[PDB]
């Protein structure tokens, strides 16, 4: 009754709704034609419902419907009186005793399997059963199932049953599930011939001879069980699924008499060949994993398949694999293949793992734009393709094997580096497409500048003109940051030695005790000539007087290239001092030029080596094989490479023979020629320069002869007569070659050979009659006049930047 | 505090590199980007390597190429040189010691 009806809702506060055809999970009711009730579906309701409900129960007497499924009760005793029953749900319950369930003559259908049941004897009664779901319980024991007849479906599986001769008595089932027990011998399941679906799983059952008389079967499920013949299921071919996971199997023919099979798990055996998989064309899923086989040939006649598991197998060519196209999944890692070609045309593929094996090509992999996984960990792959970041994947360096995923893991990674590849796919992209998208010189001179030199020569373990290296330099060589730096040493010394021009360097100032009343000379040389370069004042032979030392702050701030860079040791911080002032802005050891640059320079150096004297047509030759021909850049070039003292150049030469020149030749020529003790009298010979030099000859003699006309040092007067001349008016800074450049007007007034090498006499052979004397006095840096001289003077002294004069 | 220490640390990670100078600048009242210390580190090798004011001892730089950093470490921090520091880098090939070059301005 309805009455009834409302009266359990109210009770138990549920929507019991009027519905249809009963379910196991239903939760109303059902009428019939003059509103009688027939079915009531209890879902869930609690686990006190049947000590609460059985009242109205009994109430109405029309009830053949039961569904208690899922409500946890532990006692269903109350279950008695309602002996109109056709139906009953009982899953997953605590129930332990059935003996209630007993005067329910009538009862069609049971369902049990969730519950805790140990003993079934109660339903001993219960004739006209057709469907018995007992799975999962702990009984041990079915006799009393053996006189229910006319069950059609049963489920006794997940049990400690042993012993099943009981069910010999039952011939009329369809669908038996025997499994999760401990059974050894089915030979019971032999008079069976209406079954179609059997489920034997895992148990000790090692002869299966009874199987052959089954004929209808459809699903067969015999897996984690210790078979190794399965030659008993050869005859029969109707099985649309047969699993034979885990088990200890080596022949396979058998199974190759069936064509309709759909479904195959053949998984964790020691079956050594699969060619009987030839024929059988239908099938679509193949798990062929942990397995010792070699060839996959065989499976090349399979175009069906859509699932491939051979995961963990001795395969290594997989080439007849090329021929299936409609394939998804591709287990088949922990193997020993080497390329992925033959896999390019699998377009349908959507999961791969292809990881514990010998490969290091992953490009071929490439048009399979359909993978939604693959997996390639513990490989030895060295380079990552183009095509490994064109996937619809994000990247993952873990050891797990996901789907939509692009995993690696122990693989040496060399040229994406694993942190980049573990940082992800954005990262991995911008590093290729980094790798996708100068040269700096590292030289320098440095002239020691004296007045001490040796003692500087005794820090290099030399007549100019050396060549170092950082190792090379004692208590330098500790910093790495100027490992690949070259350094020029350049030292000379005297009185009428004068070679201005024998930034880009470091010069280190000498300083000795007796020499400082003459220090403002060099240090003003160096503002002069030179450049802006870096300088060092060192102060030597220290140990004769402990108590000198110079005002070094009154210097340093006289001249701004210093920055308090001294030392006061006698014969190490003069490593640091050089370290401190090559890497300046002022100065170049690290500047960024084109490559090409490098070469035309190591050109000109091999070219100037042996040729010690280029041509301007040379010149522009070398300079257009890397085909710069900009004057500029032409200029810059050079002069880099004068600055540096390497191949020197000047602007000045005004010869079509030399354009540049040598300084380890051109230089020491007009060394030995400013000075051989036959200029020092005051007059050269005429042509014996060969007395004085000697590869050097008379070509090169006369070369230099002009060269040494050309810069101003000399006058040739006549008949082989040579000048080397090496009011008030006071300078600073004396120019050591102001009297030889003021000595150059020799066909002007002069008297009778009159010079002191220091000054000189003139008689003026202009209008009227003069005799002037013009001498020099290096100790006081003044000029002396006796009576245009005053004009030449300008003329000379005008080439000074900025250099003080005094007169009076 | 006063004459005390502080190491900043500034990273950068895939760019030129080789064609790249880092130096720190610092400015806190729009003092026009003052030039405080450069380096032209190409590895272990490094070629520009100068300093301005304060000079070295005081102002300390360095370059690891291990993470592609670059340290600036303070001492003797004097409280009056409060400034913000900031990252530049010069790309510029031609012509060494770029300052007006600094255009990518880092972090």
């Known amino acids: 009754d309805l009455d009834v009806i409302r009266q359990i809702e109210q009770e138990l506060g549920m929507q019991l709704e009027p519905v249809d055809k009963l379910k196991w999970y239903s939760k109303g009711y059902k009428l019939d034609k003059d509103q009688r009730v027939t079915a009531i579906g209890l879902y869930d309701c609690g686990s006190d419902t049947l000590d609460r409900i059985i009242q109205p129960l009994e109430s109405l007497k029309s009830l053949s419907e039961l569904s208690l499924s899922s409500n946890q009760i532990t006692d269903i005793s109350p279950l008695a009186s309602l002996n109109s029953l056709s139906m009953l749900w009982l899953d997953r319950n605590q129930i332990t005793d059935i003996a209630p369930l007993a005067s329910l003559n009538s009862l069609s259908m049971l369902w049990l399997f969730g519950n805790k049941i140990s003993d079934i004897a109660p339903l001993e009664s219960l004739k006209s059963l057709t469907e018995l779901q007992l799975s999962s319980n702990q009984i041990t024991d079915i006799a009393p199932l053996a006189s229910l007849k006319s069950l059609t479906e049963l489920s006794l599986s997940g049990n400690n049953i042993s012993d099943i001769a009981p069910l010999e008595s039952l011939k009329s089932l369809t669908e038996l599930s025997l499994s999760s027990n401990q059974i050894t011998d089915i030979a019971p399941l032999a008079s069976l011939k209406s079954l179609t679906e059997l489920s034997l799983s895992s148990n000790q059952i090692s002869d299966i001879a009874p199987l052959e008389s089954l004929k209808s079967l459809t699903e067969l499920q015999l897996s984690r069980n210790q078979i190794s013949d399965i030659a008993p299921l050869e005859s029969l071919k109707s099985l649309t699924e047969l699993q034979l996971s885990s088990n200890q199997i080596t022949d396979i023919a058998p199974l190759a008499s069936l064509k309709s099979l759909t479904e195959l798990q053949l998984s964790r055996n020691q079956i050594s060949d699969i060619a009987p998989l030839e024929s059988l064309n239908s099938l679509s899923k193949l798990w062929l994993n942990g397995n010792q086989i070699t060839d996959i040939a065989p499976l090349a006649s399979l175009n069906s398949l859509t699932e491939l598991e051979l995961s963990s197998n001795q395969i290594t060519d997989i080439a007849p694999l090329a021929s299936l196209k409609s394939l998804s999944t591709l287990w088949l890692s922990s193997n020993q293949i080497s390329d992925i070609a033959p896999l390019a045309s699998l377009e349908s593929l959507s999961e791969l793992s292809l990881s514990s094996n010998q490969i290091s090509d992953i490009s071929p992999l490439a048009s399979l734009n359909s993978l939604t996984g693959f997996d390639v960990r513990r490989n030895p792959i060295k380079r990552l393709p183009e095509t490994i970041t064109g996937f619809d994947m994000e990247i993952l360096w873990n050891d797990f094997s996901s789907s939509g995923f692009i995993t690696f893991f122990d693989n040496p990674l060399e040229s994406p580096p694993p942190e980049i590849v573990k940082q992800g796919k954005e990262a991995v992209r911008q590093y290729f497409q980094s790798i996708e998208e100068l040269v700096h010189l590292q030289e320098i001179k440095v002239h020691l500048i004296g007045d001490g030199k040796t003692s500087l020569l005794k820090q290099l373990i030399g007549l100019n003109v050396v060549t170092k290296q950082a190792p090379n330099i004692k208590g330098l060589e500790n910093d790495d940051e100027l490992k690949e730096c070259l350094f020029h040493f350049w030292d000379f010394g005297g009185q009428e030695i004068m070679h201005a021009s024998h930034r880009s360097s470091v010069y280190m100032l000498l300083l000795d005790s007796r020499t400082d009343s003459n220090k403002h000379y060099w240090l003003r040389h160096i503002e002069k000539y030179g450049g802006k370069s870096p300088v060092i004042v060192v102060m030597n032979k220290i140990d004769e007087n402990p108590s000198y030392n110079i005002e070094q702050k009154k210097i340093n701030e006289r001249f701004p290239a210093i920055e308090n860079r001294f030392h006061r040791i006698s014969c190490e911080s003069i490593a640091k001092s050089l370290k401190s002032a090559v890497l300046h802005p002022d100065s170049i050891y690290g500047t960024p030029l084109a490559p090409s640059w490098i070469k035309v320079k190591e050109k000109l150096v091999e070219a100037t080596t042996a040729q010690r004297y280029l041509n301007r047509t040379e010149v522009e030759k070398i300079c257009n094989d890397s085909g710069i021909t900009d004057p500029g850049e032409r200029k810059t070039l050079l002069g880099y490479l004068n600055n540096l003292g390497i191949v020197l150049y000047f602007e000045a030469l005004d010869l079509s023979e030399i354009y540049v020149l040598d300084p380890h030749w051109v230089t020491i020529g007009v060394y030995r020629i400013i000075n051989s003790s036959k200029t020092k009298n005051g007059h050269l010979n005429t042509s014996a320069l060969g007395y004085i030099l000697n590869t050097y000859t008379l070509l090169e003699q006369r070369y230099l002869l002009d060269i040494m006309k050309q810069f101003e040092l000399c006058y040739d007067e006549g008949k082989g007569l040579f000048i080397i001349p090496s009011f008030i008016m006071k300078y600073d800074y004396l120019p050591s070659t102001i009297i030889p450049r003021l000595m150059i007007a020799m066909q002007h007034q002069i008297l009778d050979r009159m010079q002191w090498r220091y000054g000189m006499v003139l008689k003026s052979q202009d209008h009227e009659g003069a005799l002037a004397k013009v001498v020099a006095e290096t100790k006081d840096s003044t000029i002396t006049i006796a009576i245009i001289i005053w004009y030449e003077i300008k003329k000379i002294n005008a080439n000074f930047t900025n250099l003080d004069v005094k007169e009076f | 505090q006063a004459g005390g220490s502080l190491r900043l640390s500034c990273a950068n990670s895939?760019?030129?590199?080789?064609?790249?100078?880092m130096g720190w600048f610092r400015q806190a009242p729009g003092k026009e980007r003052e030039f405080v210390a450069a380096?032209?580190?190409?590895?272990?090798?490094?070629?520009?390597?100068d300093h301005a004011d304060s000079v070295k001892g005081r102002f300390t730089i360095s370059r690891d190429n291990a993470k592609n950093t670059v340290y600036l470490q303070m001492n003797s921090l004097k409280p009056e040189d409060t400034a913000v520091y900031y990252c530049?880098?010069?790309?510029?090939?031609?012509?060494?010691?770029?300052?007006?070059?600094?255009?990518?301005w880092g972090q």
């Open positions: 380096i032209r580190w190409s590895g272990t090798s490094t070629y520009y390597q």
């Open positions: 895939g760019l030129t590199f080789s064609t790249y100078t």
């Open positions: 530049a880098a010069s790309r510029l090939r031609a012509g060494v010691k770029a300052p007006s070059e600094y255009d990518y």
